[PDB]
Short mmCIF file of C-alpha atoms and ligand atoms in Angstrom, two decimals:
data_model
loop_
_atom_site.label_atom_id
_atom_site.label_comp_id
_atom_site.label_asym_id
_atom_site.label_seq_id
_atom_site.Cartn_x
_atom_site.Cartn_y
_atom_site.Cartn_z
CA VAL L 2 -1.53 1.38 -28.80
CA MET L 3 1.40 3.48 -26.92
CA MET L 4 1.35 3.54 -23.26
CA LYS L 5 0.13 6.54 -22.13
CA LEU L 6 0.19 7.45 -17.62
CA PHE L 7 -2.85 9.20 -16.58
CA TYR L 8 0.33 12.56 -14.23
CA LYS L 9 -0.05 15.64 -12.51
CA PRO L 10 2.59 17.48 -12.10
CA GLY L 11 4.36 16.21 -9.16
CA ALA L 12 1.98 13.97 -7.23
CA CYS L 13 2.76 10.70 -7.42
CA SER L 14 1.99 9.55 -10.33
CA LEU L 15 5.79 11.06 -10.79
CA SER L 16 7.04 7.58 -9.84
CA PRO L 17 5.91 5.44 -12.03
CA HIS L 18 7.10 8.43 -15.11
CA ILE L 19 10.47 7.93 -13.24
CA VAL L 20 9.67 4.32 -13.69
CA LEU L 21 8.79 4.32 -17.59
CA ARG L 22 11.68 6.19 -18.83
CA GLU L 23 14.32 3.90 -16.20
CA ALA L 24 12.56 1.00 -18.69
CA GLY L 25 12.97 2.74 -21.66
CA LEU L 26 10.53 2.00 -22.78
CA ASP L 27 7.34 3.71 -25.73
CA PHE L 28 5.29 6.36 -23.94
CA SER L 29 2.97 9.39 -23.36
CA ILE L 30 1.38 11.12 -21.11
CA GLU L 31 -1.37 13.20 -20.22
CA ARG L 32 -1.91 15.17 -17.96
CA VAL L 33 -5.64 15.27 -15.67
CA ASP L 34 -6.74 18.75 -13.53
CA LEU L 35 -8.18 16.65 -10.22
CA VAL L 36 -10.31 18.97 -9.01
CA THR L 37 -12.59 19.23 -12.72
CA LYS L 38 -11.80 15.40 -13.27
CA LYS L 39 -10.60 16.53 -16.78
CA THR L 40 -7.51 15.50 -19.00
CA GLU L 41 -5.11 18.16 -21.36
CA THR L 42 -7.43 17.13 -24.56
CA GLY L 43 -11.03 18.04 -22.95
CA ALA L 44 -11.55 14.37 -21.68
CA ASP L 45 -14.30 13.10 -18.88
CA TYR L 46 -11.01 11.83 -16.90
CA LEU L 47 -13.85 9.61 -14.60
CA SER L 48 -15.30 7.38 -17.56
CA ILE L 49 -11.36 6.71 -17.88
CA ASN L 50 -10.47 5.76 -14.25
CA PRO L 51 -13.02 5.69 -11.84
CA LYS L 52 -11.64 6.35 -9.28
CA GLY L 53 -10.47 10.13 -10.59
CA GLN L 54 -6.89 9.37 -9.22
CA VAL L 55 -3.34 9.54 -10.90
CA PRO L 56 -1.66 7.63 -12.01
CA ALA L 57 -3.42 5.06 -14.31
CA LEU L 58 -1.38 3.36 -17.16
CA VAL L 59 -3.28 2.21 -20.50
CA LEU L 60 -1.44 -0.65 -21.37
CA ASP L 61 -0.45 -1.46 -25.27
CA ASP L 62 -3.47 -3.88 -24.67
CA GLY L 63 -6.00 -0.41 -24.95
CA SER L 64 -6.62 -1.48 -20.40
CA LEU L 65 -5.70 0.40 -17.32
CA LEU L 66 -3.67 -0.34 -13.92
CA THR L 67 -4.37 1.85 -10.88
CA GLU L 68 -2.39 1.80 -7.98
CA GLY L 69 1.16 3.56 -8.27
CA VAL L 70 2.75 -0.41 -6.52
CA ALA L 71 1.28 -1.52 -10.12
CA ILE L 72 1.89 -0.16 -12.39
CA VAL L 73 6.11 0.10 -11.52
CA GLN L 74 6.26 -3.40 -10.77
CA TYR L 75 4.24 -3.92 -14.18
CA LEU L 76 6.94 -1.90 -15.52
CA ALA L 77 9.30 -3.48 -14.05
CA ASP L 78 9.30 -6.79 -14.50
CA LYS L 79 8.92 -5.60 -18.19
CA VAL L 80 11.91 -5.59 -18.71
CA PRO L 81 13.64 -7.73 -16.86
CA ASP L 82 17.17 -6.70 -18.63
CA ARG L 83 17.32 -3.17 -17.10
CA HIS L 84 16.83 -4.78 -12.72
CA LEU L 85 14.46 -2.03 -11.61
CA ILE L 86 13.28 -4.78 -9.45
CA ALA L 87 13.57 -8.70 -8.49
CA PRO L 88 13.01 -10.96 -9.58
CA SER L 89 9.66 -12.00 -8.76
CA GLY L 90 9.27 -15.15 -6.30
CA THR L 91 12.92 -13.77 -4.73
CA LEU L 92 13.18 -12.77 -1.32
CA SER L 93 14.82 -9.70 -2.22
CA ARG L 94 10.94 -9.45 -4.64
CA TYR L 95 9.46 -9.79 -1.34
CA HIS L 96 10.95 -7.25 0.61
CA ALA L 97 10.66 -4.67 -2.50
CA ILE L 98 6.93 -5.19 -1.63
CA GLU L 99 7.04 -4.70 1.74
CA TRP L 100 9.22 -0.95 1.36
CA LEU L 101 6.67 -0.43 -1.94
CA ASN L 102 3.92 -1.27 0.89
CA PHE L 103 5.34 1.18 3.29
CA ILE L 104 5.72 4.33 0.91
CA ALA L 105 2.31 3.90 -0.28
CA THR L 106 0.76 3.70 3.57
CA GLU L 107 2.75 4.90 5.23
CA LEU L 108 4.72 7.77 3.68
CA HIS L 109 2.16 8.75 0.55
CA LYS L 110 -0.88 8.34 2.65
CA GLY L 111 0.34 10.17 5.53
CA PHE L 112 0.78 13.60 3.49
CA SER L 113 -3.41 13.06 3.53
CA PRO L 114 -3.88 14.89 6.01
CA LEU L 115 -1.97 18.00 5.71
CA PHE L 116 -3.33 18.26 1.58
CA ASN L 117 -6.59 18.48 2.31
CA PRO L 118 -7.67 22.07 2.45
CA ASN L 119 -10.30 20.68 5.25
CA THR L 120 -7.64 20.20 7.77
CA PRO L 121 -7.00 22.42 10.60
CA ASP L 122 -3.56 23.36 11.92
CA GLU L 123 -3.51 21.60 15.23
CA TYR L 124 -3.73 17.75 13.48
CA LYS L 125 -1.67 18.81 10.83
CA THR L 126 1.37 19.38 13.47
CA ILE L 127 0.38 15.54 14.54
CA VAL L 128 -0.05 13.63 11.44
CA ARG L 129 3.84 15.92 10.50
CA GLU L 130 4.86 14.38 14.55
CA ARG L 131 3.74 11.36 12.27
CA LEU L 132 5.61 11.76 9.02
CA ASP L 133 9.33 12.94 11.53
CA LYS L 134 8.97 9.50 12.46
CA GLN L 135 8.77 7.61 9.23
CA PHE L 136 11.07 9.77 7.02
CA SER L 137 13.54 9.19 10.21
CA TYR L 138 13.68 5.25 10.10
CA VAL L 139 14.32 5.36 6.21
CA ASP L 140 17.12 7.76 6.82
CA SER L 141 18.63 5.29 9.52
CA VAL L 142 18.27 2.31 5.95
CA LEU L 143 19.44 4.72 3.44
CA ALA L 144 22.71 4.42 5.77
CA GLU L 145 23.14 1.46 5.11
CA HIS L 146 24.09 1.81 1.10
CA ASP L 147 23.13 3.76 -1.58
CA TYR L 148 19.48 3.57 -2.98
CA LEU L 149 17.05 2.14 -0.37
CA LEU L 150 16.94 -1.55 -0.84
CA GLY L 151 20.57 -2.32 -1.48
CA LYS L 152 23.54 -0.61 -3.96
CA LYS L 153 21.19 -0.97 -6.63
CA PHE L 154 18.45 1.98 -7.41
CA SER L 155 15.16 0.51 -8.29
CA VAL L 156 11.18 2.31 -8.60
CA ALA L 157 11.11 1.45 -4.77
CA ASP L 158 13.34 4.81 -5.23
CA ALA L 159 11.05 6.06 -7.80
CA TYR L 160 8.58 6.52 -5.50
CA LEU L 161 10.83 6.87 -2.06
CA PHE L 162 11.81 10.48 -3.98
CA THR L 163 8.32 11.27 -5.49
CA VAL L 164 7.16 11.43 -1.91
CA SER L 165 10.29 13.52 -0.64
CA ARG L 166 9.93 16.60 -2.96
CA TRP L 167 5.86 16.79 -0.90
CA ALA L 168 8.06 16.45 2.38
CA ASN L 169 10.42 19.58 1.05
CA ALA L 170 8.03 21.56 -0.23
CA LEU L 171 5.72 21.84 3.00
CA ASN L 172 9.01 22.73 5.04
CA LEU L 173 8.51 19.27 6.78
CA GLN L 174 11.13 18.52 10.23
CA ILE L 175 13.08 15.53 10.07
CA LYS L 176 15.34 14.24 12.68
CA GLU L 177 16.81 12.69 11.41
CA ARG L 178 17.99 13.64 7.54
CA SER L 179 21.37 13.36 6.25
CA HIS L 180 21.02 9.90 3.99
CA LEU L 181 18.08 10.59 3.21
CA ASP L 182 19.37 14.60 1.85
CA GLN L 183 22.17 13.35 -0.30
CA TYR L 184 20.03 10.25 -1.23
CA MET L 185 17.51 12.69 -2.86
CA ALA L 186 20.96 14.89 -4.42
CA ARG L 187 22.41 11.44 -6.13
CA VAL L 188 18.87 10.38 -7.27
CA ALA L 189 17.26 13.93 -8.37
CA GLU L 190 20.90 13.62 -10.70
CA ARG L 191 19.64 10.09 -13.08
CA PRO L 192 18.71 11.35 -16.09
CA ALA L 193 15.51 9.79 -16.35
CA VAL L 194 14.87 10.96 -13.07
CA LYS L 195 15.52 14.64 -15.09
CA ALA L 196 13.64 13.90 -17.68
CA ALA L 197 10.69 13.46 -16.86
CA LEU L 198 11.08 16.19 -14.39
CA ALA L 199 11.78 18.72 -17.12
CA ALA L 200 8.10 16.58 -18.85
CA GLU L 201 5.74 17.71 -15.91
CA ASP L 202 7.30 21.36 -16.37
CA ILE L 203 8.64 20.99 -12.73
CA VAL V 2 13.13 -22.78 12.59
CA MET V 3 8.99 -23.13 12.31
CA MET V 4 7.67 -18.55 10.95
CA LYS V 5 6.02 -17.11 13.39
CA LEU V 6 3.66 -14.30 12.91
CA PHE V 7 3.18 -12.19 14.84
CA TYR V 8 0.00 -10.26 15.88
CA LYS V 9 -2.81 -8.61 17.57
CA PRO V 10 -6.32 -10.52 18.06
CA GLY V 11 -8.59 -7.99 15.21
CA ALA V 12 -5.56 -6.48 14.15
CA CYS V 13 -4.44 -5.86 10.53
CA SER V 14 -2.31 -9.10 11.14
CA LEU V 15 -5.94 -10.55 10.85
CA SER V 16 -5.44 -11.43 7.38
CA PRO V 17 -2.17 -13.13 7.10
CA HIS V 18 -2.89 -14.92 10.25
CA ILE V 19 -6.94 -16.09 8.28
CA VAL V 20 -3.73 -16.40 4.54
CA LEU V 21 -1.05 -18.84 7.04
CA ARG V 22 -4.48 -21.74 7.66
CA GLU V 23 -5.49 -20.87 3.94
CA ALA V 24 -1.46 -22.33 2.91
CA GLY V 25 -2.37 -25.21 5.44
CA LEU V 26 1.13 -23.99 6.06
CA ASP V 27 3.73 -25.19 9.36
CA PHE V 28 3.68 -21.75 11.61
CA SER V 29 3.02 -20.39 14.80
CA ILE V 30 1.67 -16.97 16.38
CA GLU V 31 2.91 -14.62 18.97
CA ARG V 32 -0.35 -11.98 20.56
CA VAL V 33 1.84 -8.47 20.98
CA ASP V 34 0.29 -5.84 23.40
CA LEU V 35 0.78 -3.02 21.38
CA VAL V 36 1.08 -0.09 24.79
CA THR V 37 3.79 -1.56 26.34
CA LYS V 38 5.10 -3.66 22.57
CA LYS V 39 6.06 -6.72 24.77
CA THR V 40 4.96 -9.76 22.86
CA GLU V 41 2.62 -12.52 25.48
CA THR V 42 6.09 -14.20 26.81
CA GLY V 43 7.16 -10.55 28.16
CA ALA V 44 10.11 -10.53 24.89
CA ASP V 45 11.04 -7.11 23.50
CA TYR V 46 9.11 -6.05 20.82
CA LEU V 47 10.58 -3.62 19.05
CA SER V 48 13.89 -6.21 18.89
CA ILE V 49 11.73 -8.05 16.99
CA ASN V 50 9.96 -5.34 14.50
CA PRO V 51 12.03 -1.84 14.99
CA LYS V 52 8.66 -0.02 13.07
CA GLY V 53 6.52 -1.51 16.53
CA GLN V 54 4.04 -2.76 14.28
CA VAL V 55 2.04 -5.82 13.22
CA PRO V 56 2.23 -8.50 11.47
CA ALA V 57 5.07 -8.90 11.15
CA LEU V 58 6.16 -12.66 9.90
CA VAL V 59 9.61 -14.73 11.27
CA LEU V 60 10.56 -16.86 8.04
CA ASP V 61 12.46 -20.64 8.46
CA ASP V 62 15.79 -18.64 8.35
CA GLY V 63 15.01 -15.94 11.33
CA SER V 64 14.72 -13.29 8.69
CA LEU V 65 11.48 -10.86 8.97
CA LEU V 66 9.49 -9.87 6.63
CA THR V 67 6.96 -6.92 7.31
CA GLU V 68 3.77 -4.95 5.70
CA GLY V 69 0.58 -7.27 5.49
CA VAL V 70 0.88 -6.90 2.18
CA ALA V 71 4.63 -8.09 1.32
CA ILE V 72 3.23 -11.07 3.93
CA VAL V 73 -0.07 -12.78 1.51
CA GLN V 74 2.03 -12.28 -1.05
CA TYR V 75 5.06 -14.09 0.14
CA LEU V 76 2.68 -16.90 2.07
CA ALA V 77 0.23 -17.35 -0.96
CA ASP V 78 3.82 -17.89 -3.51
CA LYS V 79 4.48 -20.77 -1.72
CA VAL V 80 1.46 -22.77 -2.22
CA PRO V 81 0.50 -22.23 -5.95
CA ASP V 82 -1.76 -25.30 -5.63
CA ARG V 83 -4.10 -23.46 -4.43
CA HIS V 84 -4.22 -20.93 -5.75
CA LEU V 85 -4.87 -18.40 -3.66
CA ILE V 86 -2.98 -14.97 -5.83
CA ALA V 87 -3.12 -15.27 -9.45
CA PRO V 88 1.39 -16.81 -11.01
CA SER V 89 3.72 -13.94 -11.12
CA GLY V 90 4.31 -12.30 -14.72
CA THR V 91 0.43 -12.51 -15.27
CA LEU V 92 -1.78 -10.07 -16.21
CA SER V 93 -3.75 -10.91 -12.57
CA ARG V 94 -1.88 -10.85 -10.79
CA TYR V 95 -0.17 -6.80 -10.80
CA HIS V 96 -4.95 -7.01 -10.72
CA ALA V 97 -4.33 -8.63 -7.47
CA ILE V 98 -1.54 -5.99 -6.32
CA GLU V 99 -3.79 -3.17 -7.76
CA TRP V 100 -6.78 -4.85 -4.86
CA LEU V 101 -3.37 -5.07 -2.19
CA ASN V 102 -2.56 -1.18 -2.90
CA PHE V 103 -6.01 -0.48 -2.76
CA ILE V 104 -7.20 -1.71 0.14
CA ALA V 105 -3.92 -1.13 2.08
CA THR V 106 -3.95 2.77 0.98
CA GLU V 107 -7.51 3.26 -0.01
CA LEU V 108 -9.26 0.74 3.48
CA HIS V 109 -6.72 0.21 6.05
CA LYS V 110 -4.71 3.36 6.24
CA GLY V 111 -8.37 4.77 4.83
CA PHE V 112 -9.14 3.86 9.27
CA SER V 113 -6.07 5.10 10.51
CA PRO V 114 -7.38 8.41 11.27
CA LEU V 115 -10.77 6.93 12.87
CA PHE V 116 -8.55 4.64 16.05
CA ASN V 117 -6.96 7.50 17.12
CA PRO V 118 -8.27 9.62 19.86
CA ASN V 119 -6.32 11.71 18.58
CA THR V 120 -8.22 12.70 15.49
CA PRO V 121 -10.73 16.09 16.18
CA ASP V 122 -13.98 14.67 15.09
CA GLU V 123 -14.85 16.84 12.02
CA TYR V 124 -11.15 14.63 10.51
CA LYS V 125 -13.08 11.52 10.77
CA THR V 126 -16.39 13.32 9.60
CA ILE V 127 -13.99 13.28 6.37
CA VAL V 128 -13.18 9.98 6.59
CA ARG V 129 -15.81 8.06 7.27
CA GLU V 130 -17.72 9.67 4.09
CA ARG V 131 -14.25 8.97 1.84
CA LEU V 132 -14.78 5.47 3.70
CA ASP V 133 -18.13 5.11 2.55
CA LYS V 134 -17.37 6.21 -0.83
CA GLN V 135 -15.00 3.27 -1.04
CA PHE V 136 -16.75 0.55 0.63
CA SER V 137 -19.71 1.50 -2.10
CA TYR V 138 -16.97 0.98 -4.68
CA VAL V 139 -16.18 -2.11 -3.16
CA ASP V 140 -19.55 -3.36 -2.93
CA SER V 141 -19.99 -2.94 -6.75
CA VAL V 142 -17.50 -5.14 -7.92
CA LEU V 143 -18.65 -8.04 -5.38
CA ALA V 144 -22.31 -7.24 -7.49
CA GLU V 145 -20.08 -8.52 -10.39
CA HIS V 146 -18.95 -11.78 -9.55
CA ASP V 147 -18.19 -14.02 -5.75
CA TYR V 148 -15.06 -12.39 -4.32
CA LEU V 149 -12.73 -8.83 -5.05
CA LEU V 150 -11.24 -10.37 -7.98
CA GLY V 151 -12.69 -12.76 -9.46
CA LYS V 152 -14.69 -16.66 -8.85
CA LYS V 153 -12.40 -17.45 -6.52
CA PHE V 154 -11.02 -16.43 -2.83
CA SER V 155 -7.59 -15.30 -2.43
CA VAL V 156 -5.74 -12.82 -0.56
CA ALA V 157 -7.42 -10.18 -1.29
CA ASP V 158 -10.16 -11.61 0.72
CA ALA V 159 -8.30 -12.18 3.57
CA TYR V 160 -7.49 -8.86 3.85
CA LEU V 161 -11.28 -7.58 2.56
CA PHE V 162 -12.26 -9.18 5.73
CA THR V 163 -9.79 -7.81 7.96
CA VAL V 164 -10.42 -4.53 7.58
CA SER V 165 -14.43 -4.70 6.56
CA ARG V 166 -14.69 -6.34 10.37
CA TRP V 167 -13.44 -2.55 11.71
CA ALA V 168 -15.80 -1.29 9.08
CA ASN V 169 -18.48 -2.57 11.26
CA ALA V 170 -17.10 -2.08 14.26
CA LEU V 171 -17.41 1.48 14.00
CA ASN V 172 -20.53 1.47 13.14
CA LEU V 173 -19.08 2.55 9.29
CA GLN V 174 -22.09 4.41 7.20
CA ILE V 175 -21.98 2.42 3.35
CA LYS V 176 -24.89 3.42 0.52
CA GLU V 177 -24.50 0.95 -1.29
CA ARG V 178 -23.64 -2.89 0.79
CA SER V 179 -25.94 -5.25 0.71
CA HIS V 180 -22.50 -6.97 -1.58
CA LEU V 181 -20.56 -6.44 0.25
CA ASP V 182 -22.35 -8.00 3.02
CA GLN V 183 -23.19 -11.31 1.23
CA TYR V 184 -20.11 -12.02 1.54
CA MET V 185 -18.07 -10.89 4.52
CA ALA V 186 -21.58 -13.44 5.73
CA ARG V 187 -19.94 -16.02 3.07
CA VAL V 188 -16.12 -15.03 4.09
CA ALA V 189 -16.79 -15.73 7.35
CA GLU V 190 -17.56 -19.28 7.23
CA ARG V 191 -15.12 -20.55 5.99
CA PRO V 192 -12.91 -23.28 8.01
CA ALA V 193 -9.80 -21.25 7.98
CA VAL V 194 -11.36 -17.46 8.87
CA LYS V 195 -12.97 -19.66 12.01
CA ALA V 196 -9.76 -20.86 13.07
CA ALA V 197 -8.13 -17.93 12.92
CA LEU V 198 -11.23 -15.87 14.58
CA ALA V 199 -10.75 -18.70 17.17
CA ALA V 200 -6.74 -18.27 17.91
CA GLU V 201 -8.04 -14.53 18.70
CA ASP V 202 -9.90 -15.45 20.59
CA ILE V 203 -12.67 -12.86 18.95
N1 LIG F 301 -4.27 4.23 -3.89
C1 LIG F 301 -3.85 5.20 -4.83
C2 LIG F 301 -3.67 6.58 -4.92
C3 LIG F 301 -3.14 7.83 -5.55
C4 LIG F 301 -3.67 8.86 -4.93
O1 LIG F 301 -3.23 8.99 -3.94
N2 LIG F 301 -3.48 9.93 -6.33
C5 LIG F 301 -3.98 11.21 -5.92
C6 LIG F 301 -2.50 12.34 -5.92
S1 LIG F 301 -0.65 12.25 -5.22
C7 LIG F 301 -5.23 11.49 -6.61
O2 LIG F 301 -5.01 11.47 -7.43
N3 LIG F 301 -5.96 12.15 -5.27
C8 LIG F 301 -7.41 13.09 -7.01
C9 LIG F 301 -8.18 13.38 -6.02
O3 LIG F 301 -8.67 14.51 -6.13
O4 LIG F 301 -9.27 12.64 -5.48
C10 LIG F 301 -2.33 4.91 -5.66
O5 LIG F 301 -1.77 4.74 -4.92
O6 LIG F 301 -2.20 5.31 -6.59
N1 LIG F 302 2.19 -0.70 7.04
C1 LIG F 302 1.26 -1.24 7.97
C2 LIG F 302 1.01 -0.43 8.66
C3 LIG F 302 0.63 -2.02 9.93
C4 LIG F 302 -0.48 -0.99 11.03
O1 LIG F 302 -0.70 -0.11 10.76
N2 LIG F 302 -0.73 -1.94 11.85
C5 LIG F 302 -1.29 -1.77 13.24
C6 LIG F 302 -2.41 -2.15 13.89
S1 LIG F 302 -3.31 -2.71 12.37
C7 LIG F 302 -0.40 -1.67 14.30
O2 LIG F 302 0.41 -2.66 15.04
N3 LIG F 302 -0.93 0.35 15.48
C8 LIG F 302 1.46 -0.71 15.92
C9 LIG F 302 0.47 0.31 17.24
O3 LIG F 302 -0.60 0.68 17.44
O4 LIG F 302 1.07 1.45 17.95
C10 LIG F 302 0.78 -2.66 6.94
O5 LIG F 302 0.66 -2.96 6.80
O6 LIG F 302 1.07 -3.63 7.30
CL1 LIG F 303 8.50 7.22 -26.28
#
């Protein structure tokens, strides 16, 4: 069967959405309401992904893959000719895995209290201060080469771009951001990024 | 030179510490004071890992690998005959990566607000409720086979064991835990696990 990506516009699922397009693979997308857990076809999403989260990818064997970091690696490895991640077993691949884990744990999950309407303002300020430090660190790495892992665009950039959009939407203060901003401007120009954004109507 | 793991007793670094011992690799360890950022030799830890966290693994070429998820895959891939993780390219490997990311993002980082004395009670309550659901979900998986990924012990078990110890230290309420508790008793018997704990003076 053709792959299907479950997504919410602008959510973390934008990362494998971009990767799908960078990879030139065939796929469809299906929007999910994360509150009601119903998809845009009326389907009960919990019967699909019990974790009730996006992204989830239906593979061509009909099975489901969850967790963004797993999905983008799966997709990149399907298209080695596109060099969207270093080949398995190489030190470069372990550093790609390192950065994917950093993005998932320190950036992505770092936003959790900010998106919870039960979190009080004062704690949100503390959370924002930590994200300042983390994004500023990323900025320092981006001073050294065009993309996160080096000179070449990779799946880690799809993920970084996605969470960085949240930083801008939340008007996050970032002390060191000049390299990050130039990086974001460039990544936003990629045809696959533009097409993913258009498909999500954002 | 011999690979070196920087760790703090009982912290997330216990995971790659267990994996090192299970792998049978040559290594040394060095303890870090996370408050002062000095190691047990008095060395400046920020000079070693600018992120200032454990675990960090210095490889035999003198380079730095951070992020527990990256480290445990690097280590397991070095010893494929021990089958501590599925081989690359296989659907099973993507399921392992899926579980490692879940542990990193939903369990490990789930605990972060609970260890910070600046987190207000009301948010800690929300976090505890989510972890109850997440550990109960893990329990439901452990009800169906001996270890997290299936019939065999893997690096994901080293990681799950490590964060589950925190759940016990924090008296975390877990609705479904009979399988998780049996599993913890089992993993705790492994000589490599015992050796890691003894080396960390736990
Ligand atoms: N650990 C998951 C987390 C993914 C995640 O946090 N998805 C959010 C959107 S950014 C979500 O689906 N929340 C669903 C909800 O309302 O419970 C991963 O890394 O893929
Ligand atoms: N994203 C990192 C997080 C590592 C982490 O959170 N380490 C904690 C110990 S559990 C730490 O070193 N905190 C430093 C501190 O307390 O200042 C990873 O997955 O390895
Ligand atoms: Cl298509």
